[PDB]
Ligand binder design. Structure first.
Ligand code: NI
Ligand code: NI
Length: 57
DNA sequence: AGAAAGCCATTAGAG
DNA sequence: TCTCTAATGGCTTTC
């Protein structure tokens, strides 16, 4: 099964991605707690978002 | 070194 | 039926 992300979670992440397309371990834990997601989800979201940003270039 | 993070292709589920 | 993206898996890369 797959969880669906709220607007707030997706908005707060996209806002983060605006500043740096990669995350540090300290920040990655911070974000996972604030959005009530796992460290793994945050990593994966950025993997996908970086791939999505690649197709837009 | 080898754990941890990435890249990339691919899949599958939510709505 | 169709779209988008969470999630996966098998590699390579970074530290
Ligand atoms: Ni700006
Ligand atoms: Ni090695």
């Amino acid at each position: 099964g797959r969880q669906t992300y709220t607007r707030y979670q997706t908005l707060e992440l996209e806002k983060e991605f605006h500043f740096n397309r990669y995350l540090t371990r300290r920040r990655r834990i911070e974000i996972a707690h604030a959005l009530s997601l796992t460290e793994r989800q945050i990593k994966i979201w950025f993997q996908n978002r970086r791939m999505k940003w690649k197709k837009e270039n």
